[PDB]
Ligand binder design. Sequence first.
Ligand SMILES: *[C@@H]1O[C@H](CO)[C@@H](O[C@@H]2O[C@H](CO)[C@@H](O)[C@H](O)[C@H]2NC(C)=O)[C@H](O)[C@H]1NC(C)=O
Ligand code: NAG
Lengths: 49, 97
Amino acid sequence: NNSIAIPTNFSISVTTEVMPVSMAKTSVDCTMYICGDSLECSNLLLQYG
Amino acid sequence: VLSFELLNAPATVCGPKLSTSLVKNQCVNFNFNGFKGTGVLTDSSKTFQSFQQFGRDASDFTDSVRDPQTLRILDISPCSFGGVSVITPGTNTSSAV
Ligand SMILES: *[C@@H]1O[C@H](CO)[C@@H](O[C@@H]2O[C@H](CO)[C@@H](O)[C@H](O)[C@H]2NC(C)=O)[C@H](O)[C@H]1NC(C)=O
Ligand SMILES: *[C@@H]1O[C@H](CO)[C@@H](O)[C@H](O)[C@H]1NC(C)=O
């Protein structure tokens, strides 16, 4: 109840902190993934247009 | 009763059809022993076995095929090439892109 610790010296420390900000922007073409450049499939994809 | 099988082997029994000329670096639809598709035919430097006919990609998409007359190697690429973006202003202002 009558004891206290007081520092007598110090130090300077440099630390790292790594945080992500963005990811890779991606785009997807419906044709050339569902219908592989075929005319018969591209006439059926319009119903799912 | 007749039994058929279709493998990566040279064909023995074939239907009556007359071969045509070979066109390269163009968007055409081909027919190699009944395998009909659409792509750009290019000369290829890949090496096959002594019996195999068409190679395959990672997604089971045939991209190389051997013509049964020249017995050489051809490469198939899609007619559509890459992604194309269009930059436009508003249509009420102009129509130049
Ligand atoms: C705190 O600690 C540092 C070392 O980290 C001490 O710095 C020294 O100070 C003396 C003179 O006081 C110099 O001659 C030395 O070169 C310094 N560096 C080292 C590495 O010894 C400093 O004195 C300390 N402060 C205190 C005890 O009050
Ligand atoms: C017939 O097939 C052979 C062997 O594949 C080939 O060399 C030749 O060009 C083909 N055509 C004719 C007209 O002989």
